[PDB]
Design a protein around this ligand. Structure first.
Ligand SMILES: *[C@@H]1O[C@H](CO)[C@@H](O[C@@H]2O[C@H](CO)[C@@H](O[C@@H]3O[C@H](CO[C@H]4O[C@H](CO)[C@@H](O)[C@H](O[C@H]5O[C@H](CO)[C@@H](O)[C@H](O)[C@@H]5O[C@H]5O[C@H](CO)[C@@H](O)[C@H](O)[C@@H]5O)[C@@H]4O)[C@@H](O)[C@H](O[C@H]4O[C@H](CO)[C@@H](O)[C@H](O)[C@@H]4O[C@H]4O[C@H](CO)[C@@H](O)[C@H](O)[C@@H]4O)[C@@H]3O)[C@H](O)[C@H]2NC(C)=O)[C@H](O)[C@H]1NC(C)=O
Ligand SMILES: O=C1NCCc2c1n(CCO[C@@H]1CCCCO1)c1ccc(Cl)cc21
Ligand SMILES: [Ca+2]
Ligand SMILES: [Ca+2]
Ligand code: NA
Ligand code: NA
Ligand SMILES: [Zn+2]
Length: 805
């Protein structure tokens, strides 16, 4: 109930929300059907439109008008945005040369530069270049301020997940808005874009920027705008709030535009109808900047122009139907479209089985345009599994396609030509970032970055401490002139042991054998030096990784590689080695095929054993440092140490062996040497974080050898590829992956073919940031470089995407 009989007189776009049944006058009252009776009349004036004209200049104030052109309007803070241009001979902001804003130039009484976030729904990154001729105001913001060529959204690339990620710094699995549509089984409630459930606070986790601000004494404008409030009125409201007395005036504001997304769905991302929506958005930006210039705020305010996601060509005819695959399609519920989420239609149906649904959906049609995954098998870069609102069965849909349950769903709902939601690495899903103002840099291009990083920067711009989030604070310091955040590296928690030779061969009863009984003072001292770390400078190029949790581990040195060996997990946490451009690949000699050698530095009690692998019919083993890249026949024996062995399903060994034998050398050839760090990951609860030992669900049969859920590699070289990886003077270049450790290659439909036709495609899908691997391992990399720490944080957030231009 709303007592709509109260009044909005002197309350128009009030900032404090009043509680029911008292009527509302705020920018969301329309969405709740709760505005006072006179809200349209008083607050949504439209008379005489949005622009001053020559005859209006100096007019007598008529309170009925949408905006004013009378002499008093500047002191009232309610002139039309073009008032000074039409009536006082001023220029439009867009026509002024740009001039560096070295310091904020703010009116008296301003405690800090205000922040205005101008958000545009569906604004595809390539519109910045492709539409630049029809967007002069946006082009000026972009060329004069700080811009990225694109900004990566979060998955799914849908509106509500991305807008709430922008607001919180969190992945959707953590903030809880995991789609535009959701079912929460604990609440037994459904979230939809239409209707009222979405206003219930139980959906919304984390702490959004407007709450962070308010908690820390920084006042915020209300960020949300009811769809029917015209853009011109949104801009005029912001400008009016900026004229409030110092003690009442907010420091942070948001504008939102439903365009170009709205037209993009109807016409496709580049439909000829798209030019007009782009011109109109640019005109709104112009109104804001002219309005700021009139208030003497255009060299005081930081403006962010940012999108939520892009837009792809998608039509009804490119729809896959689950009814062409499943016999039991009436027993499932599908969340459809550019991603699929499947659960049982009825919790009383004990015939429901996810294993048979996945199998029926796997590689069934030659050109199949979606791939099914249990959510824990999704690429870890998507961070899309740790929430009960995310169904166990996920369909990753090819760009340009939809999935639906039955054909009747698609024509009892062709209309549309655009959609979004796909994998957030897809080029058409990328969106925009521009920052303009005193705190941003001048005429500066920055590399693409993820939208999870922006909350921290918005907090920096307002002097706020961010709530705990998934950004890496400091990784965007290169966007900022001042207000940088200068973090310290985390402290190492566990220090390593450096074991020497402590065990005789006969103390081991591991059931392993090796033909290494073939027998020099000159060269004996040399092998001892390698075991003491004499080659460590070559193979450990950026310092040893720091272990950020409590554990017992040993550093082990060898001619060709260094490792940090965990006595708890019975295998390395990390293995580090450098392969020069000139390195040669060799085979595993015949007499060493089944060779595994006790490591006399490490107790039998803290070693793997070969008998366990013999007995475990499903499990084999591989090596972290590859025997194929040994520097000499003699050094190759080190690669067969039991302390370099890790459990690997035979199907996974196909992938790993091809990476080690073929791809590493390929990368060294192309990048002028590479440093590689490889290791295991255990994430049995799919929370993106390192498992403790009591979370491990699978062991090699009969043993305490834990089975990794994933294997990672971090591959680093010199950004200036004219310098070899091991003699690099300047910035670094990285690519990394987190490969799922699966007992089949069902994910790769072409896996019966030679590995040259499918393995690298698999690896690209599972590309990762170093920071993703840090979370999953409790390790901290790049501890000892010559580079600034913020530069290193940016490098740790890099994702190599393998998308073209
Ligand atoms: C991305 O960044 C985020 C933010 O930093 C990281 O997420 C954090 O990770 C922490 C570890 O997973 C986690 O810490 C836990 O906090 C628990 C208290 O949580 C509440 O309070 C906070 C603070 O206000 C709040 O933010 C939480 O919000 C979550 O839950 C609500 C629903 O109530 C949602 O609306 C909201 O969206 C959010 O959900 C997300 O997180 C939860 C987990 O908290 C998931 O289940 C959801 O799926 C979703 O992803 C909460 O309201 C605290 O209780 C935990 O302590 C337990 O574990 C410790 C281990 O130290 C143990 O010692 C304790 O005994 C305790 O265990 C007991 O409970 C167990 C489970 O019931 C039980 O088995 C035991 O036997 C014990 O009885 C824990 O400290 C922190 O909450 C989140 N924060 C957020 C906002 O998500 C995230 O990791 C980053 N991601 C990556 C990849 O780096
Ligand atoms: O105006 C809105 N109308 C459409 C639904 C909607 C709007 N805003 C406000 C604008 O916020 C964006 C992103 C955060 C930073 C400021 O700019 C939202 C914010 C979050 C969510 Cl989840 C949905 C929103
Ligand atoms: Ca959107
Ligand atoms: Ca985990
Ligand atoms: Na075996
Ligand atoms: Na396959
Ligand atoms: Zn859309």
């Amino acid at each position: 109930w709303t007592a709509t009989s109260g009044s909005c007189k002197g309350r128009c776009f009030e900032l404090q929300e009043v509680g029911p049944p008292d009527c509302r006058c705020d920018n969301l009252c329309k969405s709740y059907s709760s505005c006072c009776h006179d809200f349209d009349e008083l607050c949504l004036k439209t008379a005489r439109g949005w622009e001053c004209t020559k005859d209006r200049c100096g007019e007598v104030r008529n309170e009925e008008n949408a905006c004013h052109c009378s002499e008093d309007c500047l002191s009232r803070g309610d002139c039309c945005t073009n008032y000074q241009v039409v009536c006082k001979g001023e220029s439009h902001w867009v026509d002024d040369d740009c001039e560096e804003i070295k310091v904020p130039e703010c009116p008296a009484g301003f405690v800090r530069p205000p922040l205005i976030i101008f958000s545009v729904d569906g604004f595809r990154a390539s519109y910045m270049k492709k539409g630049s001729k029809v967007m002069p105001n946006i082009e000026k913001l972009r060329s004069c301020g700080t811009h990225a060529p694109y900004m990566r959204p979060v998955y799914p690339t849908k509106t509500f997940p991305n807008l709430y990620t922008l607001a919180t710094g969190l992945y959707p699995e953590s903030h809880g808005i995991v789609g535009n549509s959701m079912y929460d089984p604990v609440f037994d409630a459904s979230f939809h874009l239409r209707g009222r459930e979405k206003f219930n606070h139980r959906w919304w986790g984390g702490q959004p920027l407007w709450i962070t601000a308010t908690k820390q004494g920084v006042r915020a404008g209300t960020f949300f705008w009811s769809v029917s409030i015209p853009h011109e009125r949104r801009i005029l409201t912001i400008l009016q709030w900026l004229s409030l007395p110092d003690n009442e005036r907010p420091s942070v504001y948001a504008f939102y535009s439903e365009q170009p997304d709205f037209s993009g769905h109807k016409y496709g991302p580049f439909g000829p109808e798209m030019t007009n929506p782009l011109r109109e958005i640019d005109k709104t930006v112009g109104q804001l900047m002219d309005g700021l210039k009139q208030l003497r705020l255009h060299r005081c305010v930081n403006v962010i122009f940012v999108g939520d996601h892009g837009m792809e060509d998608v039509t009804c005819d490119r729809t896959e139907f689950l009814s062409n695959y499943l016999t039991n399609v009436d027993d499932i519920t599908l969340v459809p479209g550019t991603l699929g989420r499947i659960r049982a239609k009825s919790i009383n149906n004990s015939k429901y089985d996810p294993k048979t649904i996945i199998a029926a959906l796997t590689c069934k049609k030659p050109d199949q345009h979606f791939k099914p995954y249990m959510k824990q098998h999704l690429p870890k870069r998507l961070h899309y599994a740790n929430n009960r609102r995310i169904e166990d069965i996920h369909l990753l849909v090819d760009r340009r396609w939809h999935v639906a349950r039955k054909p009747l769903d698609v024509y009892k709902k062709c209309f549309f030509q655009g959609d979004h939601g796909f994998d957030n690495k897809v080029n058409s899903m990328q969106t925009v970032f521009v920052g303009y103002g005193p705190t941003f840099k001048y005429r500066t291009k920055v590399p693409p970055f993820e939208n999870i990083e922006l909350y921290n920067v918005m907090c920096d711009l307002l002097g706020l401490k961010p709530a705990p989030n998934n950004g890496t604070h400091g990784s965007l310091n290169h966007l900022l002139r001042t207000n940088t955040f200068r973090p310290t590296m985390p402290d190492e928690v566990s220090r390593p042991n450096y074991p020497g030779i402590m065990y005789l061969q006969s103390e081991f009863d591991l059931g392993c054998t090796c033909d290494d009984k073939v027998e020099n003072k000159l060269e004996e001292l040399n092998k001892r030096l390698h075991t003491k770390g004499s080659t460590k400078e070559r193979h450990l190029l950026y310092g040893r990784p720091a272990v950020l949790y409590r554990t017992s581990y040993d550093i082990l040195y060898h001619t060709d590689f260094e490792s940090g060996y965990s006595e708890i997990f019975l295998m390395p946490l990390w293995t580090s080695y450098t392969i020069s451009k000139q390195a040669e690949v060799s085979s595993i000699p015949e007499h060493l095929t089944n060779c595994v050698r006790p490591d006399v530095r490490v107790s039998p009690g803290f070693s793997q054993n070969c008998l366990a692998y013999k007995n475990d019919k499903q499990m084999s083993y591989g090596f972290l440092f590859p025997p194929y890249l040994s520097s000499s026949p003699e050094a190759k024996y080190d690669a067969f140490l039991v302390t370099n062995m890790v459990p690997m399903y035979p199907a996974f060994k196909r992938v790993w062996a091809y990476f080690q034998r073929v791809l590493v050398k390929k990368y060294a050839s192309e990048r002028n040497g590479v440093n590689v760090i490889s290791g295991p990951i255990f994430d049995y609860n799919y929370d993106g974080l390192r498992d403790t030992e009591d979370e491990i669900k699978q062991y090699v049969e009969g043993s305490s050898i834990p089975v990794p859920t994933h294997y990672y590699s971090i591959i680093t070289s010199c950004l200036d590829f004219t310098q070899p990886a091991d003699k690099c003077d300047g910035p670094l270049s990285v690519s990394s992956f987190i490969l799922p450790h699966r007992p089949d290659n069902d994910e790769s439909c072409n896996s019966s073919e030679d590995e040259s036709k499918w393995v690298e495609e698999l690896m690209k899908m599972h590309t990762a940031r170093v920071r993703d691997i840090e979370h999953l391992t409790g390790l901290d990399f790049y501890r000892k470089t010559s580079r600034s720490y913020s530069e290193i944080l940016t490098l740790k957030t890099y994702l190599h995407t393998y998308e073209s231009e």
